[PDB]
């Protein structure tokens, strides 16, 4: 797996190039927003249980065919499998958030996930619904100003939403 | 999802060409009409429980035989599904007003509707009566602007031409 | 049924069954005015073959009205009907507008020509037409070559011919045909390898490497795997699916080698028991016992019968066993 | 013995091409050629079985009788037969499976510093 | 094909909610600088032909191994294929910049480009170097920061569109990484 | 003959559908651009004697080797045909300014031009030099309006991207 | 095909003349009432479905021989073919009215319709009766002269568009006469 | 795997035939050149390091696109992979040399090798060049008369060259 620094390092190695000065400013401005990057993942980690539980609760309030008998969440073990599947994606999105790019998300979370749900008979579009319900639940929580100095961190919020989108289209 | 943008990008993609001056020229018309087409959409959004209320019973005042036994509107949940069937169409009219083209209507409301209403034995004339009642008592200075009314009414009779 | 022995035939058990029955030849040149059952049968057969089993609703069928028109007059099947059906906005919306170009090429070799391309040289002959002259000449490249008028009649519907030698392709494209055509109950939004959004074969038709034919309707037929090519020159990951080469010392130590693909892995049904084991149910990592279904193996000869115990007792189902 | 005359370049090249799994890699390492003269020729069958139980199964022996019991498979079936019947136990498959490197299972108690 | 208008429709359709006046302001702000978006798209279409050729020539002059015998851009056929490969990417990025939504190159261009290049043997480093060069050219054209070419615009700020088109270029390299 | 109208009627005809609201919406953009695209056209019409004169000799000042023996511009009628070849392109630029799309250019000037200029051994770089000279000394307040220069220059480098 | 703008281009191309400011006034007058042309086209597309069915029913109620056994509109298949035949004509007339030039139904609709109908046995009298009814309906919709339906327009005169659309219907009947 | 004796034994078994007397002379003349067969593999084994190293050195002197940056031998690990790939083929050719036929070469060295190099992006024609550079490096060394009685062993040298040819065409 690679973070954002190791990615440009692999780019520069695979053509044998010294890193230009402009790439050094591109990395220095990632260093510049380090505390703001850390605040987002800290706020997501502190609310991770309520994110998954409220998103899952709102999923079955509007898709009640899943928890009714015969559905793909009608058990206690299929239901516990669903909650733990949502925590997996919330975990790996937060890994990709501090990595700076989605290598660890694509590599050991999303690779082969669509085929898994097709083999199990799990409806992948309803997984895609639950992922976008966690997405804005975490985005609206990352725009909360309690416990942080007041400033701008909107581009990082868009970067965080991009990972949830990438995980959402990877599962249908 | 047919719209102004969706048409010109598929035309340029089928020709395999970059966006030309005529492609950018068509979006200026979208810019000039957004300031009359969006008013109608949120006026419908802010008022839609009363407009579907007067359309659904106008459907039943014209065709009172629908509440007969053996018909499509016998008991109460059929009538509640009828009000829902009308509200679904008004929501799609709001969506086509927001998009700019008729994409949401022929994507989710029109395509396959004749097969559904035939085998489920629903009369389409009772559908078009409620839409025609909504179109005919749209009153253009009060309810909307002068230009928003023509944009709102042009999507309404698209449904009437599609269902009949 | 299923198998290769019972009815003394093999190709109908692979789901090619309805495609061995009819011909749809369109006998008289124009439509006789007065009568219309025969031509409605031909119209429905052309929609079934050209769109590959999708539901053109009547609201959508009302706008190929000008194309059914001239076909009922003195204009062709192959040059008036099937060509103008590929240039309408119901075909373009399904097989061009949602796909990339190389997804649109194989979906036209399936619909129009009834086969699969092999190698790069069949793809790049057709993408070079698109990149110069647009989609409207990209469509005519399938009809106006030395392929359509030599295997198809001017009035027959273009049947599937990718499985036989008389389409003188190869043997790798024989097995690529059953990735595209999985029986008579399947369509293009409908097979798992392409859900009207991707390229159905991408790595396999470019490189011409063949894909083991799982018959549809078999026990364990929903086997499909992802792609992550190993090796560090292309910087890929090792550990996703088994190899297909049988290279070193374990090729022929412990006899000849095989490649088993198994598909259905579930969290209950591991242990030496009939029921699930209850308790905490996941480890500290809380992933799974098998973190993905559709695993494949490379096994020797006298490791095959214990691997067969280990697959089936643990709830897995064997898709295909090929030698190596 | 992570010296270079002990390293097998060919089990490694087959492991990173997904031809063999981790369980087959452990089987290749126990039946490997430097293991058969630096650990097998220097023990009897009784010490060698507790070596192979401690390093493959990740646990200590239960008592003396387990060493005496498993000592017979080595003699009558070779190292190959012994390592097959060891790697196919329920204990190995329930803990490591076919795709996890073995390790010393549950060595230290979690409160305490000094463990096993 | 989803533009910026159909995106909020598919967002509010899962809600089964009417598009109200709260979330409509993000759409009227899209109309308020539609002229800036057209002025921005025109400045890229105007000199796409220099943009592609400069990008592949810079990728080659940075990595001289591609033109060695057996390199991926060795012969004339492979070099023409590379100049053809880059222009399609620029065309789809222009489509997405005009539409205001990236959903036109997620499915028509990048869906399957990842394994196409590694079935072909196309090296993934040089492709992201070339589109990074194309991104640096595109941001230098949305603003009037190009060196020898200056285009006449009305006065104002276009940094939002430059960040948007940069965000359209990073997912191209991320799709093939 | 690609233009704003020609695109939307071809799209509605391929869909087999009537003109919708998005079809009428694109023509409003043509109406709004007609008042800046037509003054560039007749400004070119009223001045094309001198615009073609300064471009053709700018072609020869850059490439003075064209007047060598054995070249494309050896004697006098080749140069007279060169000025005619330039005037043909400026007339097509005027036609595309009048139409609204790039239809007259790729119909009569672009399609097949690479086959002609290769076998008749004409350098396309000498064609694009005269067009680039015309584009670079278009001077936006005096020669046109501010918006007409935007429109006139966008068709000029369409030729440069098509020939190179 | 050809709109009103490309018609003067093909007119001045045989001249090899630049489009000058003398003949441009016929094009700026075309722009000056483009809103009236769109307002006119919308009023026909709005109720084309009643326009077709009323025209075929009026043609049948004028000539009751068509529904006789062996008549050309006898069975359900032939009647559906007649309602399909009329709608295509109305669609192409709407295309020509929007384009401002008749050259779109010159070659896509009327080119060969003459001998198609007499190879089919379609009687030519009822065909021109039906489109004459459709012409009388269309002129009654360009102006607000329809009886039970009134559409709201801005005030002014639309007689030029009514004469233009009548001239678009005269050549349909002349092509099949 | 089979040697040359077991191959004719499998031929005779699979038709249930006793071995004729003429096949016994065919095997006795393989016994006759046993010392000459052993001398070849002994000379190849004694020079195995210099064979691989000189062939690899001469490969990059004439194909310098491999070791330049971006090539498929530009690392220290891809380079060490290449040298060890050449030793593999030199090992299995020498196995087939004392076996008498190419069963062990075809069976556990060349089976699936072309597909492996196609999956990795390794140019198989350049592998074929290096194999023929080891071929005549070993052939010219097997015609050296130092340390052996002077006699004829040319047919065995042609048999040795055949295995290198078989491995060369199996990799393209
Ligand atoms: C919101 C809940 C949705 C849902 C979930 C669901 N999932 C499963 C089964 C599996 N899910 C996985 C996925 C992963 N495993 C991993 O290790 C990782 C880490 C990268 C992921 C993403 C796997 C492998 C399985 C199968 C293993 C298993 O059986 O647990 C199940 C079924 C569980 C069962 O059938 O016993 C459900 C119900 N399904 C829904 O309907 C919701 C939309
Ligand atoms: C002269 C060097 C050429 C070259 C070699 C090269 N090979 C690899 C990678 C692999 N080679 C194999 C081949 C075998 N593995 C075996 O076990 C056997 C025994 C029968 C053979 C013949 C395999 C499986 C691999 C992949 C495993 C691995 O990664 O090592 C590589 C790439 C190594 C890497 O990418 O990390 C190279 C460079 N390549 C050349 O360019 C030379 C022509
Ligand atoms: C222990 C773990 C750990 C953390 C969680 C971070 C948290 C942290 N963030 C900031 C500092 C900051 N944190 C933020 C982030 C935000 N502010 C907002 O108003 C938004 C709600 C949110 C955007 C996502 C911003 C924007 C600043 C800089 C203040 C500013 O310029 O606006 C600082 C002060 C140092 C500085 O000035 O950068 C610290 C200590 N650092 C750590 O070591
Ligand atoms: C997204 C767009 C969308 C729609 C337009 C509707 C369309 C629609 N309506 C109904 C279903 C129905 N629609 C009606 C409505 C009526 N019957 C009448 O007599 C009147 C004509 C009218 C009320 C005024 C009724 C009564 C049913 C139930 C019919 C039945 O199940 O017996 C069904 C079948 C599924 C169901 O029972 O709900 C569908 C698809 N639904 C949608 O999801
Ligand atoms: C070793 C080989 C080598 C080259 C061939 C050049 C090529 C080149 N030019 C630019 C960079 C650029 N290239 C252009 C492109 C153009 N400018 C114009 O005025 C024309 C319209 C158009 C075609 C010439 C622009 C606008 C920039 C950004 C500003 C600038 O540097 O000029 C970059 C980006 C640097 C980066 O971020 O990686 C490169 C590699 N530089 C090199 O190092
Ligand atoms: C709709 C989206 C779409 C695309 C993006 C392209 C993608 C694409 N590129 C190539 C094919 C290629 N693309 C490249 C390009 C490059 N290789 C390099 O070393 C450079 C990094 C880069 C140029 C900048 C090369 C060299 C080929 C090889 C063609 C060949 O093998 O002859 C091929 C297959 C063979 C062919 O068509 O020629 C395809 C499908 N095509 C599409 O339809
Ligand atoms: C159909 C073809 C078509 C076009 C080509 C554009 C042409 C165009 N651009 C702008 C107008 C403008 N364009 C810009 C854009 C910029 N200014 C800068 O200094 C930056 C370099 C750049 C950012 C990308 C700005 C800032 C305005 C002023 C109006 C506004 O801010 O929205 C306007 C409105 C005002 C005017 O008349 O000039 C028009 C018509 N619009 C069209 O309809
Ligand atoms: C309707 C659109 C239209 C055009 C664009 C031109 C394109 C065009 N030019 C020429 C033909 C030519 N065009 C040129 C022009 C030039 N040669 C040069 O060295 C310079 C690049 C340039 C002058 C600046 C010359 C010299 C010939 C004559 C070539 C020859 O016959 O030897 C011909 C061949 C027929 C002929 O000889 O006239 C054609 C089709 N003609 C058209 O009808
Ligand atoms: C219809 C198309 C059309 C054009 C594109 C221009 C092109 C053009 N420019 C000039 C003529 C000129 N063009 C310029 C250039 C400029 N003038 C300035 O004040 C600025 C510094 C700069 C604009 C950026 C100058 C200074 C002259 C005067 C003579 C010269 O120096 O060339 C002439 C010669 C006749 C004249 O003097 O007007 C022509 C044909 N004229 C046209 O009719
Ligand atoms: C014997 C059978 C018979 C009929 C069925 C009717 C049909 C009919 N209606 C009109 C004539 C017309 N028909 C319409 C059409 C409509 N008006 C509307 O408000 C609706 C939107 C739409 C469908 C009803 C219009 C607008 C006119 C012109 C004004 C009028 O007469 O109402 C004409 C034209 C007369 C002519 O010039 O030949 C005919 C034949 N009349 C008949 O003689
Ligand atoms: C692009 C332009 C275009 C058209 C205009 C139509 C033209 C057209 N009409 C018919 C065919 C027909 N058209 C009619 C229509 C009529 N006969 C009458 O007596 C009435 C006067 C009139 C209805 C108002 C009938 C009755 C048929 C006969 C179909 C049959 O024979 O079953 C046919 C051939 C058979 C068929 O398609 O069914 C064609 C090509 N199609 C096109 O593609
Ligand atoms: C994109 C969709 C689109 C439309 C549907 C039309 C809508 C439309 N119509 C007119 C405007 C008008 N429309 C008419 C037309 C008529 N008036 C009559 O009394 C006759 C019945 C009828 C003749 C056919 C007239 C007379 C005007 C006034 C302006 C003018 O005369 O040009 C106007 C300009 C003034 C206004 O805001 O109302 C617009 C926007 N235009 C569009 O851009
Ligand atoms: C310890 C391992 C071991 C070996 C390496 C061999 C080596 C060996 N080779 C020969 C004997 C021989 N060896 C060779 C081989 C050759 N002579 C040449 O001149 C060529 C260079 C080369 C051919 C490849 C020949 C040809 C003979 C027989 C002498 C003759 O008749 O020419 C003899 C003497 C016995 C005899 O007469 O056959 C021995 C001991 N035997 C072993 O036990």
From TrEMBL, chains A, H:
Location of the protein in the cell: Plastid, Chloroplast thylakoid membrane
One Pfam family here: Phycobilisome
Binding site residues for (2R,3E)-phycocyanobilin 1: 35, 39, 153
Record has Electron transport as a keyword: yes
Binding of (2R,3E)-phycocyanobilin 2, residues: 72, 77, 82-88
Sorted UniProt keywords: Antenna complex, Bile pigment, Chloroplast, Chromophore, Electron transport, Membrane, Methylation, Photosynthesis, Phycobilisome, Plastid, Thylakoid, Transport
A single GO BP: photosynthesis
GO CC field: chloroplast thylakoid membrane; phycobilisome
InterPro entries: Globin-like_sf, Phycobilisome_asu/bsu, Phycobilisome_asu/bsu_sf, Phycocyanin_b
Entry membrane topology: Peripheral membrane protein
Residues modified as N4-methylasparagine: 72
Family label: Belongs to the phycobiliprotein family.
Entry protein name: C-phycocyanin beta subunit
Species this chain originates from: Porphyridium purpureum
Name of the gene: cpcB
From TrEMBL, chains B, F:
Annotated GO CC locations: chloroplast thylakoid membrane; phycobilisome
UniProt entry tagged with the keyword Plastid: yes
SUPFAM superfamilies on file: Globin-like (SSF46458)
Xref: CDD domains: PE_alpha
Cell location: Plastid, Chloroplast thylakoid membrane
GO biological process: photosynthesis
Record key words, sorted: Antenna complex, Bile pigment, Chloroplast, Chromophore, Electron transport, Membrane, Photosynthesis, Phycobilisome, Plastid, Thylakoid, Transport
InterPro entries assigned to the protein according to its UniProt record, in alphabetical order: Globin-like_sf, Phycobilisome_asu/bsu, Phycobilisome_asu/bsu_sf
Membrane topology: Peripheral membrane protein
Stated name of the protein: Phycoerythrin alpha subunit
Organism: Porphyridium purpureum (Red alga)
Automatic annotation (TrEMBL), chain C:
UniProt domain PBS-linker: residue ranges: 7-189
Any single GO BP term: photosynthesis
Keywords linked to the UniProt accession: Antenna complex, Chloroplast, Membrane, Photosynthesis, Phycobilisome, Plastid, Thylakoid
SMART domains assigned: CpcD
Any one Pfam family match given in the protein's UniProt record, by short name: CpcD
Primary localisation category: membrane
Domain of life: Eukaryota
CC terms in the record's Gene Ontology section: chloroplast thylakoid membrane; endomembrane system; phycobilisome
Compartments, record wording: Endomembrane system; Plastid, Chloroplast thylakoid membrane
Membrane topology recorded in Swiss-Prot or TrEMBL: Peripheral membrane protein
The CpcD-like domain, residue ranges: 255-324
PROSITE patterns: CPCD_LIKE (PS51441), PBS_LINKER (PS51445)
PANTHER family per UniProt: PHYCOBILIPROTEIN APCE (PTHR34011:SF6), PHYCOBILISOME 32.1 KDA LINKER POLYPEPTIDE, PHYCOCYANIN-ASSOCIATED, ROD 2-RELATED (PTHR34011)
Family named by the database record: Belongs to the phycobilisome linker protein family.
This protein's name: Phycobilisome 31.8 kDa linker polypeptide, phycoerythrin-associated, rod
UniProt source species: Porphyridium purpureum (Red alga)
UniProtKB/TrEMBL annotation, chain D:
Subcellular location: Plastid, Chloroplast thylakoid membrane
Part of the whole protein covered: 59 to 174 of 232
Membrane topology listed for this record: Peripheral membrane protein
Sequence ranges assigned to domain PBS-linker in this UniProt record: 1-116
Gene Ontology biological-process entries: photosynthesis
Recorded GO CC terms: chloroplast thylakoid membrane; phycobilisome
Protein name: Phycobilisome rod-core linker polypeptide
Predominant cellular place of this UniProt entry's protein: plastid
Organism: Porphyridium purpureum (Red alga)
UniProt entry keywords in alphabetical sequence: Antenna complex, Chloroplast, Membrane, Photosynthesis, Phycobilisome, Plastid, Thylakoid
Family statement: Belongs to the phycobilisome linker protein family.
The UniProt record lists the keyword Thylakoid: yes
Protein origin, superkingdom: Eukaryota
């Amino acid at each position: 797996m690679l973070d954002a620094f190791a990615k440009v390092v692999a780019q520069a190695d695979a053509r044998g190039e010294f890193l230009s000065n402009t790439q050094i400013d591109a990395l220095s401005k990632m260093v510049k927003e380090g505390n703001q990057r850390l605040d987002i993942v800290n706020k997501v980690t502190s609310n991770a249980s309520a994110i998954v539980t409220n998103s899952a609760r709102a999923l079955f309030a509007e898709q009640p065919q899943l928890i009714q008998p015969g559905g793909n969440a009608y058990t206690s073990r299929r239901m516990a499998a669903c909650l733990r599947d949502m925590e997996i994606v919330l975990r790996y999105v937060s890994y990709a958030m501090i990595a700076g790019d989605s290598s660890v998300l694509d590599d050991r979370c999303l690779n082969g996930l669509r085929e898994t749900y097709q083999a199990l008979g799990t409806p992948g579009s309803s997984v895609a619904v639950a992922i976008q319900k966690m997405k804005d639940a975490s985005v609206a929580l990352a725009n909360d100003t309690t416990g942080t100095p007041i400033g701008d961190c909107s581009s990082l919020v868009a970067e965080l939403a991009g990972y949830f989108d990438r995980a959402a289209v990877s599962v249908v | 999802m047919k719209s102004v943008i969706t048409t010109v990008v598929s035309a340029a993609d089928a020709a395999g060409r970059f966006p030309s001056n005529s492609d950018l020229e068509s979006i200026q018309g979208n810019i000039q009409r957004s300031a009359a087409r969006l008013e109608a959409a949120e006026k419908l959004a802010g008022n839609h429980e009363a407009v579907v209320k007067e359309a659904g019973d106008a459907c039943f005042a014209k065709y009172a035989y629908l509440k007969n036994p053996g018909e499509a509107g016998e008991n109460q949940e059929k009538i509640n599904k009828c009000y829902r069937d009308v509200d679904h169409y008004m929501r799609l009219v709001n969506y086509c007003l927001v998009v700019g083209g008729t994409g949401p209507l022929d994507e989710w409301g029109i395509a396959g509707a004749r097969e559904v209403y035939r085998t489920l034995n629903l009369p389409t004339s009772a559908y078009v009566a409620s839409i025609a009642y909504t179109r005919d008592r749209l009153c253009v200075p009060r309810d909307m602007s002068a230009q928003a009314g023509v944009e709102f009414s042009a999507y309404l009779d698209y449904l009437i031409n599609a269902l009949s | 049924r299923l198998g290769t022995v019972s009815g003394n035939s093999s190709l109908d058990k692979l789901g090619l069954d309805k495609f061995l029955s009819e011909s749809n030849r369109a006998y008289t040149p124009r439509a006789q005015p007065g009568f219309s059952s025969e031509y409605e049968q031909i119209i429905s057969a052309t929609y079934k073959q050209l769109f590959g089993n999708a539901y053109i609703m009547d609201s959508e069928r009302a706008e190929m009205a000008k194309q059914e028109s001239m076909f009922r007059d003195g204009q062709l099947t192959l040059k008036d009907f099937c060509r103008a059906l590929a240039k309408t906005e119901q075909y373009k919306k399904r097989f061009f507008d949602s796909r990339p170009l190389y997804g649109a090429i194989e979906l036209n070799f399936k619909n129009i020509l009834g086969r699969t391309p092999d190698g790069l040289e069949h793809y790049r002959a057709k993408s070079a037409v698109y990149d110069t002259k647009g989609y409207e000449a990209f469509v005519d490249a399938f009809f106006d070559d030395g392929e359509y008028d030599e295997v198809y009649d001017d009035y027959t519907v273009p049947f599937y011919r990718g499985y036989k030698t008389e389409a003188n392709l190869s043997m790798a494209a024989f097995t690529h045909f059953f990735r595209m055509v999985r029986g008579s109950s399947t369509s293009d939004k409908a097979n798992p390898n392409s859900m009207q959004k991707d390229i159905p074969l991408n790595y396999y038709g470019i490189t011409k490497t063949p894909l083991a034919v799982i018959a549809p309707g078999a026990a364990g037929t929903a086997y499909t795997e992802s792609f992550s090519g190993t090796g560090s020159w292309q910087s890929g990951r090792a550990g996703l699916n088994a190899a297909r080469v049988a290279l070193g010392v374990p090729a022929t130590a412990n006899g000849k080698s095989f490649r088993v693909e198994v598909t259905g892995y579930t969290q209950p049904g591991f242990g030496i028991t009939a029921g699930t084991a209850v308790g905490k149910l996941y480890k500290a990592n809380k992933l799974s016992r098998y973190p993905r279904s559709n695993k494949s193996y490379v096994v020797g000869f006298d490791e095959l019968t214990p691997l067969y115990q280990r697959i089936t007792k643990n709830g897995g189902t064997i898709a295909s066993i090929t030698p190596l | 013995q992570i010296l270079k005359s002990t390293k097998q370049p060919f089990l490694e090249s087959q492991l990173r091409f997904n031809q063999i799994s981790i369980k087959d890699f452990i089987k290749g390492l126990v039946l490997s050629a430097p293991f058969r003269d630096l650990n097998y020729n220097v023990n009897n069958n009784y010490r060698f079985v507790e070596i192979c139980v401690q390093r493959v199964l990740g646990r200590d022996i239960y008592n003396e009788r387990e060493k005496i019991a498993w000592s017979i498979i080595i003699a009558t079936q070779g190292l190959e037969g012994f390592i097959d019947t060891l790697l196919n136990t329920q204990e190995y498959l329930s803990n490591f499976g076919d795709s996890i490197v073995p390790f010393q299972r549950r060595r230290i108690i979690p409160q305490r510093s000094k463990g096993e | 094909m989803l533009d910026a208008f159909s995106r909020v429709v598919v967002n509010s359709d899962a809600k089964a909610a009417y598009v109200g006046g709260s979330d409509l302001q993000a759409l009227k702000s899209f109309i308020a600088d539609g002229n800036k978006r057209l002025d921005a798209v025109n400045s890229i279409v105007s000199n796409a032909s220099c943009m592609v050729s400069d990008a592949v020539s810079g990728m080659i002059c940075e990595n001289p191994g591609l033109i060695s015998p057996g390199g991926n851009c060795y012969t004339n056929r492979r070099m023409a294929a590379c100049l053809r490969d880059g222009e399609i990417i620029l065309r789809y990025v222009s489509y997405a910049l005009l539409a205001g939504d990236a959903s036109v190159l997620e499915d028509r261009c990048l869906n399957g480009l990842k394994e196409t290049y590694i079935a072909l043997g196309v090296p993934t480093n040089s492709s992201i170097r070339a589109v990074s060069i194309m991104k640096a050219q595109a941001v230098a054209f949305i603003t009037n920061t190009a060196t020898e070419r200056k285009m006449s615009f009305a006065a104002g700020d276009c940094t939002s569109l430059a960040s948007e088109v940069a965000s359209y270029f990073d997912r191209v390299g991320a799709a093939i990484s």
